[PDB]
Design a protein around this nucleic acid. Structure first.
Lengths: 113, 51, 48
RNA sequence: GUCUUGGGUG
């Protein structure tokens, strides 16, 4: 009678953006990103990918409430780099790593036959 | 579960027999803005079932 | 007034008076019975 | 819609 729908976890409404970027003015060259309809799966992956770049100085995420399906991520970079650019770079790098992983798994499965 | 990292402490783990008691929240949640009153005192009536 | 002693509804068609109403009716019966003794025979063990 | 009785909860 107060239970929300089990598909509001992942189905993005039309009035809710998938992604929203605001800058943190306290420290230089930092941005706050809210990811809607996502959870720890994307957040931790992105966080541990970004934490290993030389040009990324701060990166973190939190899920403020478990009953709401979003997370917010703080990411700072050095003077030349833009945190947004580091975010596309991390996404592309993880995509390539998964592609190589898929190719090798398929080859291994074929060899096992 | 969030990170796959090991927990620094170990967890006491195993089956235990639990019971489903008759007290459910949906049988208890009650709100009233305005509703029926008593005939004599004209004060709100008594009872979740009676609003 | 009847506000102090309102009636109630049992099953959609039934009403019983409040206790005070039946008590007042009993008082009225007693009063009229008193007015039926100083008007005729009353051998002193009915007036009291 | 009322009064008593009984079984309970924090």
């Amino acid at each position: 009678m107060n239970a929300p729908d089990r598909f509001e976890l992942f189905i993005l409404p039309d009035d809710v953006p998938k992604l929203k970027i605001t800058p943190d003015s306290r420290v230089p060259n930092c941005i706050i990103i809210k990811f809607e309809r996502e959870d720890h799966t994307l957040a931790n992956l992105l966080r541990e990918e970004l934490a290993l770049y030389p040009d990324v100085t701060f990166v973190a995420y939190k899920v403020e409430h478990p009953l709401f399906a979003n997370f917010v991520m703080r990411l700072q970079t050095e003077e030349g780099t833009r945190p947004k650019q580091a975010l596309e770079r991390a996404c592309a790098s993880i995509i390539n790593k998964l592609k190589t992983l898929d190719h090798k798994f398929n080859e291994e499965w074929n060899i096992k036959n | 579960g969030h990170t796959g990292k090991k927990l620094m402490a170990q967890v006491f783990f195993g089956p235990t027999y639990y019971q489903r008691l008759r007290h459910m929240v949906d049988d208890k949640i009650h709100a009233r803005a305005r509703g029926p009153v008593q005939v004599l005192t004209r004060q709100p009536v008594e009872g979740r079932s009676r609003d | 007034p009847p506000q102090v002693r309102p009636s109630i509804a049992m099953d959609e068609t039934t009403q019983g008076q409040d206790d005070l109403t039946h008590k007042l009716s009993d008082i009225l019966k007693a009063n009229i019975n008193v007015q039926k003794l100083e008007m005729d025979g009353s051998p002193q063990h009915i007036i009291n």
